[PDB]
Write a protein that binds this DNA or RNA. Structure first.
Length: 49
DNA sequence: GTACGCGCTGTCCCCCGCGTTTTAACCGCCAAGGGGATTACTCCCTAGTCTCCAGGCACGTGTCAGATATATACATCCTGTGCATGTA
């Protein structure tokens, strides 16, 4: 979440994005929530609800 | 008068540039603690101010020091002044 590259690529002008990854981490919901927010900026920060 | 500033010369030589090697620094982790100037508050105590009585460095006066003009007892030529022996 706090990485500079995370905010670096958010402003890029694209209308469709695709993610390629083998396996994300199961627990530690923070990284999954961060990936979800990066995919589209609509979800709320509160993932503990 | 003269010799050093100036102009010219060759001699070579050390940094420039372009390339190649090596490395300092920021990003991620993983969020953790850690301390020092700041703001507010609470006492607290020593200089400002007044105060008069003592007194002391700027000031004027005396006297030795340093330097200078003045007779003074010789000092060095200068002026008369006298003597002895050979000459026509």
């Amino acid at each position: 979440f706090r990485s500079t590259r995370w905010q670096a690529l958010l402003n890029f002008n694209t209308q469709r994005r695709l993610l390629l990854t083998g396996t994300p981490l199961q627990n530690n919901l923070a990284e999954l929530w961060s990936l979800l927010y990066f995919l589209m900026p609509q979800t709320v920060i509160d993932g503990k609800k």
